[PDB]
């Protein structure tokens with residue numbers, strides 16, 4: 227069914243699957259871990275709604291989640307903070323400036339400024355967040371049939387991004403230029419995820435990273 | 448004048464700029480130890496680096512940047528650039544990484560450095576992906592230039608600094624134009640063109656991942672001062 231969707235159907239699906247913006251519950255690391263943990267529960271249920279994701283085996287679903295989770299968290303943060311220059315909107319009651327580790331903060335800030343400079347639209351945002359889910363773990367995996375399916379869904383999402391842009395009036399040159407601009411930021415999101423994951427470790431927080439079994443269990447629930 | 452180039456002139460510039468293929472040390476002691484394999488790899492990478500700076504200086508637009516920004520882009524990109532070169536050299540050697548014509552390593556050989564094998568498998572997967580896609584040489588040089596300009600652009604305050612970033616993004620747009628031109632010229636439909644562009648750019652995210660994972664183990668890394676001195680020479 228996912229491969230028969232039109233660009234409008236794809237966008238409508240992803241917009242309806244969007245998680246809500248959560249609040250923090252009242253240390254800073256404690257507040258952020260608690261927020262991320264509640265965000266993770268919504269992310270599984272969002273992932274199940276990304277067209278094509280539930281066609282994969284449970285093992286492959288876990289592997290993609292297991293690789294994309296912090297990138298998804300981060301891209302959501304950068305989206306939330308777009309309209310707050312100089313600050314990261316972890317939650318509406320948890321808005322941070324740099325003075326409040328700083329290297330990654332600055333990288334997140336730069337990404338928000340870039341989305342702002344590009345006038346990133348929410349319909350584009352949801353497509354990119356789906357791309358991360360399906361792409362981040364695909365090169366590190368039935369497996370053949372599974373990878374083929376993932377790449378066909380990814381092509382569907384490209385088509386949808388191009389359709390969105392054409393509908394907005396972008397020339398053909400502009401469509402491809404913007405498509406390349408958006409995807410290249412995904413290489414910066416990966417970078418930031420890997421450094422975040424390195425920073426979690428150096429803070430002695432290797433325990434907050436969701437394990438394969440946690441994801442599998444959350445997904446079977 | 449970099450942004451005045453046509454697509455055909457960009458491809459020609461990038462092809463002419465390609466670095467040479469170097470050899471590894473001749474007849475090393477085999478089987479390798481951890482230390483010895485690392486030694487060989489470090490020595491090869493150190494010598495590749497010099498030619499990488501020569502190549503970088505010929506990537507259109509690169510020398511319009513300040514020396515400080517040129518070094519910053521190379522600090523961020525060098526390992527990704529070495530890795531994409533490795534993956535390209537290895538396309539026609541499934542299951543194997545052609546570090547040099549005289550250093551062709553399979554997976555079991557990666558195990559000799561604890562933790563290496565996981566990056567080894569990622570590199571082999573990327574080479575299989577390029578084979579599956581029938582990556583063309585002209586496309587490869589465009590990709591490798593994208594990594595140089597993009598990897599460090601987001602971590603550059605002043606009018607000049609915004610002009611530097613704007614210049615980088617404009618050159619990146621030109622290379623996008625060039626990739627599309629190559630694809631259209633090959634006969635791909637518009638739909639195919641956009642799909643193939645996305646597929647190529649998404650592989651860049653994986654190469655970044657591998658570079659992050661390998662840099663972690665490096666912690667060998669070329670210093671700011673080394674790169675600056677090489678750039679002025």
Ligand SMILES: O=S(=O)([C@@H]1C[C@@H]2O[C@H]1C(c1ccc(O)cc1)=C2c1ccc(O)cc1)N1CCCc2ccccc21
Pocket residue numbers: 254255258259260261262263265299300302303316327328330331421422423425426434435
């Ligand atoms: O890289 S960080 O360690 C990590 C990435 C991002 O910020 C942190 C975090 C997180 C993830 C899962 C955890 O269990 C706990 C924390 C992130 C995050 C959380 C929710 C969200 O919706 C989006 C992103 N980091 C650097 C910059 C600022 C900062 C301040 C305090 C502590 C850490 C950091």
Ligand SMILES: O=S(=O)([C@@H]1C[C@@H]2O[C@H]1C(c1ccc(O)cc1)=C2c1ccc(O)cc1)N1CCCc2ccccc21
Pocket residue numbers: 485488489490491492493495529530532533546557560562563564566567657660661662664665667668
């Ligand atoms: O990703 S790795 O860090 C990096 C990729 C490739 O293998 C390594 C290497 C390299 C780079 C610079 C060095 O000074 C030394 C080694 C590589 C290399 C790639 C292209 C090229 O043209 C020349 C060298 N890595 C995996 C394999 C074994 C290994 C063992 C210990 C820690 C890391 C790794």
